[PDB]
Amino acid sequence: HDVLSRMISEKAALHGLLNCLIKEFAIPEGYLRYEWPDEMKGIPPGAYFDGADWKGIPMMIGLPDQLQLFVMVDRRDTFGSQHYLSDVYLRQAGDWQCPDFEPLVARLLAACEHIAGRKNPELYEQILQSQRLVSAIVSHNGRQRADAPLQHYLQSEQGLWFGHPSHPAPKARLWPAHLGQEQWAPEFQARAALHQFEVPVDGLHIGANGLTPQQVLDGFADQQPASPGHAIICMHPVQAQLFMQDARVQQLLRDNVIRDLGQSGRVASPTASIRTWFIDDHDYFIKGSLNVRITNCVRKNAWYELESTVLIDRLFRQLLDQHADTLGGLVAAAEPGVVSWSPAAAGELDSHWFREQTGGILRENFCRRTGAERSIMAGTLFARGVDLQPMIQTFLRTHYGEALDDNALLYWFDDYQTRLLRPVLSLFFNHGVVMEPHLQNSVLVHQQGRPQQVLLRDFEGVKLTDDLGIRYIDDDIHPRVRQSLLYSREQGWNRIMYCLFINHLSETILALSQGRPQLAPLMWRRVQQQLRAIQGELKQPSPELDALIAGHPVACKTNLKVRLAASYVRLPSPW
């Protein structure tokens, strides 16, 4: 079982790396051919030939350091979404080889490093560490029914075994090592009581929408233990350990100005975002700062960001009330409450530090409103299970009473895509509101398998265009919070492109059409039609939409190229 788990994890990892290679270099720079090699010596027949036919289509990548890559794929895809049907062969001077995982990664990286002209051995390490975690993960969860992550929201958050599917090291998480992974890994069904402090109320910065400051505090922590003039704040246990190494906190603990309460907060389970916690049957998610690098960001939230949260949440309520008819059926998770602390006399830069350390966001637990059994995170929905099969296939067969034919499938997709596209594009063109509707920021609400809503999340990412979305922001807003939220229209459109089409739906189509690649052309064609529809539904000019429909190239955010340097490339349209 362990060897098998190592094997699973390696295939996953190399796949995600191929994704990076193909999306970020091979296609934009014309290194990719759908052809058979000249000499084939080194490849066993069984790798491209199944007894009856070729195992799909041959993929060639010649790299300008004279390295060549060969893999069998199920489909020709302009966003570089396809199943890999063989192991990976490399060639150099003649003679194909199938290197072990570690030697393979190394050389593939050396290839990119060469095009980019720049090295990162930090990256190689992270690639290795990511995969060895996936090995642990698969070995832990390898006994379960493959599609258990789809039966329950929490399990949907703890079942993204492989993380971002187009990422060199999706599961790289760099904590002071003595702390371990397991205790904080959703993939291990981690639970921890939150860490808690007593702080004097006069240092508190609270934002609240439709709630009292007190209620915001209750959301985070039962305030009962608090002595007069004081309140209880909570924090990622890891974040509290880091927080306490700082002599400024040392000083405050010694002078009794604040108190270390223990892991005495609510018992919660971190979600796939790691720093956001879920509490079954509580009105809120708890989001907090974590000064730890995770898939390359450190997961801090700055003062002005804490502050922007409040404005976006307040904007979203206005729009859902007064402008419902133009939000394309938007369902979004409210972020109505914000807390942070700093000493009353702290002085500007300590104040910033302190609030960034202690900042917390209250997010609506949509599950009360939606049913835990009925909500699944998009990322997991369209991810692979512990047996490398997409989980969606068996999940839907259990709901539909029988195996879905092509028509059942095409129909399901249509129902899904429309509930993503309409809200987001209606937010952009009509109101200049820029969402980040990638897979981690989306939640399917279904009824016996049938799509009802694609809930959208994460006000942190929301942005307001300089030409339209600006006007919703007041002149009484601090210049830094304003800058934080401001985007150019070009910027907005770039992010939306990456997210909707390449990040999100490209994956949807791939999971849905696994084993039936002929559906892909058909699903994308439905996406085009859907775009024309939305357009004629719209209250403001949308020339970026004409362009997309017309088959202009699509923006693609990079996960490998960025690390070796260049953030967006351009992928050919699927129509």
The binding site for ATP comprises: 273, 275-276, 287, 295, 299, 363, 438, 440-441, 503
- Cα dihedral sign for 215, 217, 218, 224? negative
Core vs surface per residue 68-100: b (16+ CB within 10 A) or e: bbbbbbbbebbbbbbbbbbbbbbbeeeebebee
Contacts 24+ apart (CB under 8 A), 464-473: 464/432, 464/433, 464/434, 465/428, 465/432, 465/434, 465/489, 465/492, 467/432, 468/431, 468/432, 468/540, 469/431, 469/432, 469/433, 469/434, 470/432, 472/315, 472/318, 472/431, 472/432, 473/311
**Binding-site residues for AMP:** 295, 299, 438, 503
Which 8-state DSSP code applies to residue 324? Answer: G
End-to-end CA gap in the chain:
44
Residue 484 has, within 13 A of its CA and on its CB side, a CA count of: 22
Strands 486-487 and 463-465: what pairing?
A: parallel
- Would you say 330 and 320 are in contact if contact means Cβ atoms under 8 Å apart? yes
Tokens 């049938």 belong to which residue?
450
**Binding-site residues:** 273, 275-276, 287, 295, 299, 363, 438, 440-441, 458, 503
Tokens 């091979």 belong to which residue?
26
H or E stretch at 255: none
Q: Given 3-state DSSP classes, what are the helix, strand and coil percentages for the chain, each rounded to the nearest 5?
A: 45, 20, 35
Measured distance CA(113)–CA(566) in Å, rounded: 14
Q: What is the DSSP string of 408-450?
A: HHHHHHHHHHHHHHHHHHHHHHHH-EE---SGGGEEEEEETTE
- Helix axis angle for 543-550 and 519-535, nearest 10°, is 160
**Binding-site residues for Mg(2+):** 440-441, 458
The CA-based diameter of the chain, rounded to the nearest angstrom, is 81
- Residues preceding gaps in the chain (C to N > 2.5 Å): 93, 565
Q: Which two tokens stand for residue 251?
A: 């000083």
Starting at the edge strand that comes first in sequence, how are the strands of the sheet with 192-193 ordered?
192-193, 267-270, 276-278, 284-288, 360-364, 337-341, 204-208
**Binding-site residues for adenosine:** 503
Written as one letter, the residue type at 364 is E
**246 φ/ψ angles, rounded to the nearest 5 degrees:** -75, 125
Where are the extended beta strands (E) located within 98-255?
173-174, 192-193, 195-200, 204-208, 230-235
